[PDB]
Amino acid sequence: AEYDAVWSKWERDAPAGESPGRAAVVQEMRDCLNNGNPVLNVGASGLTTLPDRLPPHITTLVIPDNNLTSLPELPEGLRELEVSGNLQLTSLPSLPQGLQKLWAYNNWLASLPTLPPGLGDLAVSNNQLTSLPEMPPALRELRVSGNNLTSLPALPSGLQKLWAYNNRLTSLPEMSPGLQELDVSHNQLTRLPQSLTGLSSAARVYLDGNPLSVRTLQALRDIIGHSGIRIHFDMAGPSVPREARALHLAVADWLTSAREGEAAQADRWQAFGLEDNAAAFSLVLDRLRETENFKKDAGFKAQISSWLTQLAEDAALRAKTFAMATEATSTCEDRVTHALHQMNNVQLVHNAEKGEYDNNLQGLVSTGREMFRLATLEQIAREKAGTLALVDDVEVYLAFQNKLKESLELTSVTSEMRFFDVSGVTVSDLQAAELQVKTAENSGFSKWILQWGPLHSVLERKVPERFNALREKQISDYEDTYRKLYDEVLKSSGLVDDTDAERTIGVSAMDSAKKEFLDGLRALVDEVLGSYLTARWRLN
C-alpha cells in the first residue's frame, strides 16, 4: 500500500553502499505488513537514515549497530524497543503508551522522552544522559549506568533493581522498600538516605567508589553487622579528606538564575576565592547544594543566592561569614547547622548596623523569635541526627523547616515542600519539635534576646545614650568591685601582690559587673520592646 511507496524511496535515496542493507530491511518490513510479523529487527547494515513510516502492527522493534542520527515516529503497538550501537543517536522519539521494554544502550542519548505509564524495563546505559524523566509506576528495572546523571528521580515502589554505575549522582532519593539490587557504585555520593535500612535482609547494595563520609562508613558497618544486609563498600580504603573547589565554581552552581547581575556577581567571587577561609565557605555551599532539598525546591537556591549578594558588597561581613564556615569543616560534618545560623546572625548584625531595624522594632522581635525558633530546631535536629544512622544534622534540620514553616511562622524558610519526606523523621518527631519550640519561646525568649547580636546593634542605634550608660556602668562597677574584693583579701592577709591574684580578683569583679550589666539590659529591653516580648503561643 502507501507504506510500500515510502520504503521504496527510502531504499532509492540510500547513499552509495547502503542500498543493499536498506533493501534487505524492506523485505522484513514487507514481511511484517503482509503476514503480520510482530517483530521487526533492522540489520546492522550501517544505515544512517530510517524510513519515516514503518509497520504499525509490530510490537517489537530492534535497531542494532547502525549509524542512525534519529528515529522515525514509533508505532502505537510497540511494547519492546531496542536500539544499540547507534553512537550518533542523541534522542529518542515519543514513546508509545503501550511500550513495555525500552533498551537504548551504547548510544549517545542526551535526553529521554516521557516514559509511558506501562514501562517496566528501562536500559539507557552507556549514554549522554544528564537527567531522567519521571519513572513510570510499573518500572521494575532501571539501567542508567555509564551516564552523566547527578540526581535520580522519584523511584516507584515497584522498582526491583537499579544500576547507576559510573554516574555523577550527588544525592539519592528515598529507596523503594522492595529493592533487590542497588548499584550506585563509583558516583559522587557523600551520604545515603535512611531508607537503605528498610531494604530486604538479602538485598545486594553496591556503594563502593563513592566519597562516602566517615560517619556514613561507620553507619554502614553497624547496619551490616546488625541487620545482615549485604552491603559492599570500601572499608580498608584510605579515608579521603574533602578537597575544596575554587570558591567561584561553587558559587556559580548557586547563581543559575537569569537576573541581570547574577552571572557578573559570580565572576567577582574569583577574587573572593583567594580570601582567607574561602575554602571552608566553598565546602559549605557544596554540602548544601548536593542535597535532595536543593534538587527539588528552587526556593532553596533563591535563599542562598540572594545571601551571597550581600557578601559580595560587604567585605567585613564576607570575611566573618567565611570564618563561620571553618566550624563545619573542622570536623567532617555535623557542625554545618551551627555555622549556617552564625552566618545568618552576622548577616543580621550588619543589616542592623545598616539601620534596617532602626524603625521596625516590631520586626526586630519577629526576626528575633524566628531566629530563636530556628536556633532551637538546630538542637532538635542534632538530637535526631544521632538517632538516625544515615542522616546528619543538615538533612533533619531542612525537614523541620519545611514541615514546621507554617506551624512556627518561619517566614525565613523559602522552601515549600509538602510531599518531600525524609526517612527517619516521623510526624511524632515534628509535633514534639513544634511543641518544644513553642514551649521554649514562651518560657525563655526574653532571656535569649538579651544575648542576641542584632539586638545590641539596634540598641546602639535607637537607644545609644541608655545603652552606652550601661556599658560605661559595667566599667565603673567592675572597677569598684575589684577594689572592694581587693581589700577583702587584704583583711584575710591573702595574696594580692602577685599578678595572677589580681587577675583572679578581676574575673570575680568582671563577673559581678556582667551580672549587673545583664540586669540593666533586661530592664532596657522591656522598656523599649517589652510589649513585643509577650508569650506568642497559646499552649496547654
Numbering used by the authors: 161 to 700
From the paper:
The SspH/IpaH family of novel E3 ligases are found in a number of Gram-negative bacteria and are used to target host enzymes for degradation to support pathogenesis. NELs are found in a number of Gram-negative bacteria, such as the mammalian pathogens Salmonella and Shigella and plant pathogens Ensifer fredii and Ralstonia solanacearum. They are composed of an N-terminal secretion motif, a leucine-rich repeat (LRR) domain, and a C-terminal NEL catalytic domain and are structurally conserved across the family. Crystal structures and mechanistic studies of NELs have provided insight into the activities of the two key functional domains: the LRR domain, which is responsible for substrate recognition, and the NEL domain, which can be divided into two subdomains: the C-terminal subdomain containing the E2–Ub binding domain (E2–UbBD) “thumb" and the N-terminal subdomain, which encompasses the catalytic E3 region containing the active site cysteine. Many pathogenic bacteria contain E3 ligases, most of which structurally resemble their eukaryotic counterparts, yet some bacteria, including Salmonella and Shigella, have evolved a new class of E3 ligases, the novel E3 ligase (NEL) family, that have no structural homology to eukaryotic E3s in their catalytic domain but function via an active site cysteine, analogous to HECT or RBR E3 ligases. These catalytic cysteine-containing E3 ligases transfer Ub onto the substrate in a two-step reaction: first, Ub is transferred from the E2–Ub conjugate to form an E3–Ub conjugate in a transthiolation reaction, and subsequently onto lysine residues in the substrate or Ub itself via an aminolysis reaction.
To better understand the mechanism of SspH1 and the apparent differences in activity, we solved the crystal structure of a construct containing the LRR and NEL domains but lacking the first 160 residues, ΔNSspH1 (now referred to as SspH1). The structure was refined at 2.9 Å resolution with one copy in the asymmetric unit and a P622 space group. The structure is elongated with the LRR (residues 161–393) domain extending away from the NEL domain (residues 405–622), which contains the catalytic cysteine (C492) and the α-helices of the E2–UbBD (residues 623–697). It is similar to IpaH9.8 and IpaH3 in an “open" conformation, with the position of the E2–UbBD relative to the catalytic loop in an analogous position to other bacterial E3 ligase structures. The E2–UbBD of SspH1 consists of two long antiparallel α-helices and a small C-terminal helical segment, as also seen in SspH2. In our SspH1 structure, 60 N-terminal residues, those in the LRR–NEL linker and the loop containing the catalytic C492, have a higher B-factor compared with other residues, suggesting more flexibility in these regions. We observed a symmetry-related molecule in our structure of SspH1, where the E2–UbBD of one molecule sits on the top of the LRR domain, close to its substrate binding interface.
